[PDB]
Amino acid sequence: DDAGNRLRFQLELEFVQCLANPNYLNFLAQRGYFKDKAFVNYLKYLLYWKEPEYAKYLKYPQCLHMLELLQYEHFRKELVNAQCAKFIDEQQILHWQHYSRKRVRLQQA
C-alpha cells in the first residue's frame, strides 16, 4: 500500500530495463543468480516492470526472455556460451539505429 509505492516502484522501473541484459547473462545464469523457484515466481509475477522511462539504469533486463529460458531450461544449462549471448546482445541493442549507419554507408559509396 504505502510502502509499496516507495519500495516496489523504486525496485521495479529500475529492475528490468538496461543493465544485466543478455550481454553478460550467460555467465550469470549458469553459475546461478535467479534459477531458484521462488525467485523465478517473483520475477514472473513482476514481469510488468520494463518501462522505457527508466531504460538506462536498471538491475536486470529481459524479464520475459529470462522466464522463457527458465521454463525451457535455456538459461542455466543451455546458452551458457558467452560469445553467442554477447553477439546476440550486440545485434539487439544497436539494431534500431542501424538505419542511420546503413544510410551513411550508402551515401559514402
Partner: protein, 161 residues
C-alpha cells in the same frame, strides 16, 4: 541475471498478499537512484542569452556553416598571430567564451535538427498508410474479377447446351 531481494520479496506472493503492480511514472518520483527528471530541455535559445549562429535570413543551418567557416579562419589567423606575436595570454580566455558558443554547438551539425522535420514526416507516415491503402484499392479491383466469375455463370449456361 541477478537476484534483486527487494523486488523478489515484493513480488513473491500468491493472492492479494502481493503489493500493487509496477506502474509507469508520469510525474516526479524517487525510484531508486534515477532522479526521473521530466520535461528534459531540448530546444535551446539562439539569440536570447548567448551568441546566435543563425542570422535573420531564416537559414539557421547555412548561417551556422558560415559561422563555422569564420571560426576556422579566425583560428588560423590566431595561430598565425601566435607564431608571429606570441605575447598574447588572453587568447585562451576566449576559449572559455567558446563554451558559451558550445551551448549553441550543443545543436550544431550532427543529429538534432532533422527530428523537427520528422514532425512533418509524421503526417507523411499516414500517407504511407494511404500508399498501403492504394494497394488495398487493388482488392477493390478484385471485386471486378467477381464479374468475371459471373461470366463463368454465363459459361455455366453455354456449357449446358
Amino acid at each position: 541475471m541477478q537476484y534483486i531481494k527487494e523486488y523478489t520479496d515484493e513480488n513473491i506472493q500468491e493472492g492479494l498478499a502481493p503489493k500493487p503492480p509496477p506502474p509507469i511514472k508520469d510525474s516526479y518520483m524517487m525510484f531508486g537512484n534515477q532522479f526521473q527528471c521530466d520535461d528534459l530541455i531540448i530546444r535551446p535559445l539562439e539569440s536570447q542569452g548567448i551568441e546566435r549562429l543563425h542570422p535573420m535570413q531564416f537559414d539557421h543551418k547555412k548561417e551556422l556553416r558560415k559561422l563555422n567557416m569564420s571560426i576556422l579562419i579566425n583560428f588560423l589567423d590566431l595561430l598565425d598571430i601566435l607564431i608571429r606575436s606570441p605575447g598574447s595570454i588572453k587568447r585562451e580566455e576566449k576559449l572559455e567564451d567558446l563554451k558559451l558558443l558550445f551551448v549553441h554547438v550543443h545543436h550544431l551539425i550532427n543529429e538534432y535538427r532533422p527530428h523537427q522535420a520528422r514532425e512533418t514526416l509524421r503526417v507523411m507516415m499516414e500517407v504511407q498508410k494511404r500508399q498501403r491503402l492504394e494497394t488495398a484499392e487493388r482488392f477493390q479491383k478484385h471485386l471486378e474479377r467477381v464479374i468475371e466469375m459471373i461470366q463463368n455463370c454465363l459459361a455455366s449456361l453455354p456449357d449446358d447446351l
